[PDB]
């Protein structure tokens, strides 16, 4: 099974900036017919993959000319001259030369822009959560970029990491900024015991961790 590797796993590039994806093969995928069967597929979020290039260079009918591929042996690359918004997505390699035919790892293509500071927040549990016999503590980290974000809970100075819910939102379109909704759940007996609950956030824009705490004893 020919293994295909793609680098980089992420390629942040601004609009109008040339992008270049690289593909490597575990073994030469050349074929006796004089052609090597490599194809490139783009899968936008929530949609089926779309063919872009086949036989290394040939462009599928109905694709913008900005896309272009090339390579040989075990080295292939895909070049986008001028990137636009509809070009966002994941690009997949595909070798159709040696049975079985395998897919590439995938290279998530994103757009880069000026770093935006995180917008952190914290909300305590609700009353119905108390009635049901549990606790739900939530921390929101909204509109932060790039992905260099880390979240850590220091309950009364003690770091809590067990049972940490982690939720990140894909890159937006209106602002193209990431967001996180990491949370945790506690029990009433365990929710009324510890005095101080904390939710920190580590980001590049501010080397010093951003502190967001709320005291159970209040």
């Amino acid at each position: 099974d020919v293994l295909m590797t793609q680098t980089p796993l992420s390629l942040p590039v601004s609009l109008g900036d040339q992008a270049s994806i690289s593909c490597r093969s575990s073994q030469s995928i050349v074929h006796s017919n004089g052609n090597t069967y490599l194809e490139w597929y783009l899968q936008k979020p929530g949609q089926s993959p779309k063919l872009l290039i086949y036989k290394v260079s040939n462009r599928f009918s109905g694709v913008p000319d900005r896309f272009s591929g090339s390579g040989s042996g075990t080295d292939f690359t895909l070049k986008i001259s001028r990137v636009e918004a509809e070009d966002l997505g994941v690009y997949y390699c595909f070798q159709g030369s040696h049975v079985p035919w395998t897919f590439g790892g995938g290279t998530k293509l994103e757009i880069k822009r000026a770093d935006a500071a995180p917008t952190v927040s914290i909300f305590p549990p609700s009353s119905e959560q108390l009635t049901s016999g549990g606790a739900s503590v939530v921390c929101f980290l909204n509109n932060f970029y790039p992905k260099d974000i880390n979240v850590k809970w220091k309950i009364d100075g003690s770091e809590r990491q067990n049972g940490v819910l982690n939720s990140w939102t894909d890159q937006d379109s209106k602002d193209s900024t990431y967001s996180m909704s990491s949370t945790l759940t506690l029990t009433k007996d365990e929710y009324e015991r510890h005095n101080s609950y904390t939710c920190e956030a580590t980001h590049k824009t501010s080397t010093s961790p951003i502190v967001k705490s709320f005291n159970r004893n209040e």
Partner: protein, 218 residues
């Protein structure tokens, strides 16, 4: 040309499912049908292929024995049967039309979603959330409306008749324990929040539930 796939399916662990891909507008018997698995996390994996004309079939080593392909020439449909379903078999399955060494996977199906779990059709448990008592009020305040304890997907969380189309961050749903949960946040001025009325419109078409509950200002 068009490939039509069956609808979404939900099965219990240890059961078996039979997805169908119907192809119309071309010589169905002469084109291989590629089956592709895409886990929600990431990656495209090729399960195998079948040529409806003959009985030939191929399987990727990872899926050998898990999946069995059958084709019906009378009705232009191709089937895949998954045996001994487990949690890792929950994914989106695509069917594509392929001709090796020639025309590539130019046409794809809409994609069938299969979820493996022992849960039932639990309705939502929306818990509206308000800013904490110990929290400063700034010019731009973000709202929050939590939803948890629901199954299966999807649940369309939105605002009153698109009350706030912009500034909305609907985070992806996640499995806390056995049920799905999500959250949302919309940015609004503090001046208009007391006056303007906005309600997180949680929906659950699977359970035929349409419940609207706004977050009363604290």
């Amino acid at each position: 040309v068009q490939l039509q796939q069956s609808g979404a399916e939900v099965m219990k662990p240890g059961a078996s499912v039979k997805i169908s891909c119907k192809g119309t507008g071309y010589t169905f018997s002469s084109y291989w049908i590629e089956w592709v698995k895409q886990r929600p996390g990431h990656g495209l994996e090729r399960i195998g292929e079948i040529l409806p004309g003959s009985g030939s079939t191929n399987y990727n080593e990872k899926f050998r024995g898990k999946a069995t392909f059958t084709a019906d020439k009378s009705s232009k449909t191709a089937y895949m049967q998954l045996s001994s379903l487990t949690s890792e078999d929950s994914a989106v399955y695509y069917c594509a039309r392929y001709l090796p060494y020639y025309y590539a996977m130019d046409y794809w199906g809409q994609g069938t979603s299969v979820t493996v779990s022992s849960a039932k059709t639990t309705p939502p448990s929306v818990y509206p959330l308000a800013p904490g008592s110990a929290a400063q009020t700034n010019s731009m305040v973000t709202l929050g409306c939590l939803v948890k304890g629901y199954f299966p997907e999807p649940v369309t969380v939105t605002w009153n008749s698109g009350s706030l189309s912009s500034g909305v961050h609907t985070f992806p749903a996640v499995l806390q324990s056995d049920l799905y949960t999500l959250s949302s946040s919309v940015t609004v001025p503090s001046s208009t929040w007391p006056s303007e009325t906005v309600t997180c419109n949680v929906a659950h078409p699977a359970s035929s539930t349409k419940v609207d509950k706004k977050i009363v200002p604290r």
